[PDB]
Structure formats: C-alpha cells, structure tokens
A paper describes a structure:
Using this strategy, we determined the crystal structure of the fusion protein at a 2.5 Å resolution in the P 21 space group. In the structure, an asymmetric unit comprises two BCL-xL and two p53-DBD molecules. The two p53 molecules (molecules A and B) contact each other and form a groove. One BCL-xL molecule (molecule C) inserts deep into the groove, and interacts with both p53 molecules. However, the other BCL-xL molecule (molecule D) sits outside the groove, and interacts with the p53 molecules to a much lesser extent. The structure of BCL-xL/p53 complex shows that the two p53-DBD molecules dimerize through an interface of approximately 900 Å2. In our structure, the p53-DBD dimer covers an interface of approximately 1600 Å2 with BCL-xL-C. This BCL-xL binding interface comprises residues from the N-terminal loop, β1 and β10 of p53-A, and from the helix 2, β10 and loop3 of p53-B. Tyr22 and Asp156 of BCL-xL contact with Arg248 of p53-B through a hydrogen bond and a salt bridge contact, respectively. Most of the residues that were predicted to interact with p53 in the structural model indeed binds p53 in our structure. It is worth noting that a region of BCL-xL (amino acids 99-111) has poor electron density in BCL-xL-C, although this region has clear electron density in BCL-xL-D, suggesting that this region becomes flexible upon p53 binding. More importantly, although mutations at p53 dimer interface, such as Y107A and H178A, are not located at the p53/BCL-xL interfaces, they still disrupt the interaction, indicating that the formation of p53 dimer is important for the interaction between p53 and BCL-xL.
The tumor suppressor p53 plays central roles in regulating cell-cycle arrest, DNA repair, and apoptosis in the response to cellular stress. BCL-2 and BCL-xL are anti-apoptotic members of BCL-2 family, which inhibit apoptosis by directly engaging the effector proteins BAK and BAX, or sequestering pro-apoptotic BH3-only members. P53 has been reported to directly interact with and antagonize BCL-2 and BCL-xL, thereby leading to effector activation and ultimately apoptosis. The DNA-binding domain of p53 mediates its interactions with BCL-xL and BCL-2 at a surface outside the hydrophobic groove for BH3 peptide binding.
Numbering used by the authors: 3 to 25, 45 to 63, 72 to 90, 93 to 149, 162 to 355
Write the structure that this text describes.
C-alpha cells in the first residue's frame, strides 16, 4: 500500500510531458511507459461513469505479463491527461486511487511470484491554443424544462426540435473566418461506423427550415449563415456556422442547436446512445479544438436525467 509512490509519481510524470503539475525503480517505469507509447496507439469518461470505465478496460487485458503492467500504468496516464482536458480535474486523484487498488488485489501477486526489476471520427478532447471549452446552462430537472445537462454524466437531455443552447468558451479570441462544426456519432463501438441520421418519419415530415437537408439530425437555429455537409467519403452529416466573438459584455458565444429526431426512433437512432462532437476550425478547415458530450433526445428531459443520476 506504499507503491503509492509509483502511481503518484508515474502519473505526475505523464502530466509533466503535457504541461500539468499534480498540485529508485521510478526511472525504470518511465522509460518503459514512454517506450511503450511511441510504439502504440491507445472509451468515454465522466465523473459518474468513472469507475465503470476503469473496471472494464483494466479487466480486458488473458494472462498478466510484464508487458501489460506498462500497458496498465500507461493507460492510467492518458486517463488523467484526458480527464484534465475534459475540464474534469477531480478524477486525477480518484484515478490514482483506483490505480492503487487494482494492482494491490489483481496485478501484484503475480510480481512477487517473479520479483524481477529488469471510418470513425475521433472524439479525443483538445482544448487547443485558443482554450476551447464548452459551457451549458444549469437548468435543473423540473418537468417543464426544454433542455438540461448532467455534469456527472456529461450528458445533455433535450426535447425534439427545441432550443439546446451550448456555450463556447475560449481563452483567446480565434481569428475571423473561424467556424464551429457539430457532428453526431454512435457511442457504442459496434455502431460507431454507422452514420447517425433521421428516421423515415421525421425525415419526411414538414419540418424543414429551408436550410437543413431533411436527413440531418442536428440543426442550428436562428442563423442564416449555417452550412450543412454530407461528407464525400465518410457520408457523415455535420453542420457548421461561422464563429462570432462573445456579445457585448458576455464572455461566451452561444449556438442554438436543434435535435430533430428522438433517440428511440425506429429507422433512426433506434434507442442507441449518441455523442455530439463540436470542433473549432479555421477558414482552411484545420482543427483548432474539439469537445464532445453525450446527447439523448426524449419526451421529458427532466425525468430522464434525474432517473439516470439517481442510479449513481
Ligand atoms: Zn425520428
């Protein structure tokens, strides 16, 4: 229980390589941890679903060898960095605690027996040089609310075709010509290759604003400069608007998104969970920053969020 020095130092080292401070046989793990990274690749994380993502990934890697321990320590390193990227700093100390309770029960008893000292759009969060973060109104879960967001799940519940305000926060103002793109993908791995689109009923219902194509799940409300993309090679849908600096006195910019199809719609999402990816891009289309959040479109956003959070 004092291998804590290994976890508390190895993770703080991977935070050093990215610019974060924590706030013998130590060298040995960093070289392997590093040497494993340049030769590798390397699953969503929320403050509530945090221990779940640790039970799953660590149990899924089937005889413990000297190679998986690096792969496990290195796994906890990316987790703490991505947790801070997602503006979820709280999980860093929690991850070290879980990294201290798995090796103590499952992984070490193998080491004392040895004792030797020698197609799919990515969803990784990047805040980028402009400090790009997402903000949400804290609207509670009373039965009458159009849209609500759950921080414990980083999940937004909204009613169909209702204003979903999403805030863009930046440390510095991106140059003119900057654009903001929204895109939905399926959350589960088995469906991530499938394009999220509207179901036949809502696709052919008289709801068009005259700007969005009838097959697009996500629309932007109140913006004549809105642009809709059906990708030439991935066939994925996205919607982009020009970024505007915050209003007079404000310090965030608010896009009004609409979700035009319900989560349980047969022929569409068919009760499958989706994520919405917001990217900041310049005029030439280079990526400046990316954040994502799960979305569910339902009839009563209030009751569904409270029902989900009461499970935590
Ligand atoms: Zn539908």
């Amino acid at each position: 229980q004092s291998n804590r020095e290994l976890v508390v130092d190895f993770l703080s080292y991977k935070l050093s390589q990215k610019g974060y401070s924590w706030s013998a046989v130590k060298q040995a793990l960093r070289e392997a941890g590093d040497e494993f990274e340049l030769r590798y690749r390397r699953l969503h994380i929320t403050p509530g679903t945090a221990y779940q993502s640790f039970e799953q990934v660590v149990n899924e890697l089937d005889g413990v060898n000297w190679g998986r321990i690096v792969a496990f320590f290195s796994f906890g390193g990316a987790l703490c960095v991505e947790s801070v990227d997602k503006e979820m700093q709280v999980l860093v100390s929690r991850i070290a605690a879980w990294m201290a309770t798995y090796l103590n029960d499952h992984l070490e008893p193998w080491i004392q027996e040895n004792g030797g000292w020698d197609s799919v759009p990515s969803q990784k969060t990047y805040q980028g040089s402009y400090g790009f973060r997402l903000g949400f109104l804290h609207s509670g879960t009373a039965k009458s609310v159009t849209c609500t967001y759950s921080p414990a799940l980083n999940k937004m519940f909204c009613q169909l075709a209702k204003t979903c305000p999403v805030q863009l926060w930046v440390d510095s103002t991106p140059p003119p010509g900057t654009r903001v793109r929204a895109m939905a993908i399926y959350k589960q791995s088995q469906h991530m290759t499938e394009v999220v689109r509207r179901c036949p009923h809502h696709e052919r219902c008289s709801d068009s604003d005259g700007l969005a194509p009838p097959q697009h799940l996500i629309r932007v409300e109140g913006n004549l400069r809105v642009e809709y993309l059906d990708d030439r090679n991935t066939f994925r849908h996205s919607v982009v608007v020009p970024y505007e600096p915050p209003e007079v006195g404000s310090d965030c910019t608010t896009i009004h998104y609409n979700y035009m199809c319900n989560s349980s719609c047969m022929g569409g999402m068919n009760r499958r969970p989706i994520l919405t990816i917001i990217t900041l891009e310049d005029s030439s289309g280079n990526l400046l920053g990316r954040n994502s959040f799960e979305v569910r479109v339902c009839a009563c956003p209030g009751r569904d969020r409270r029902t989900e959070e009461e499970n935590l």
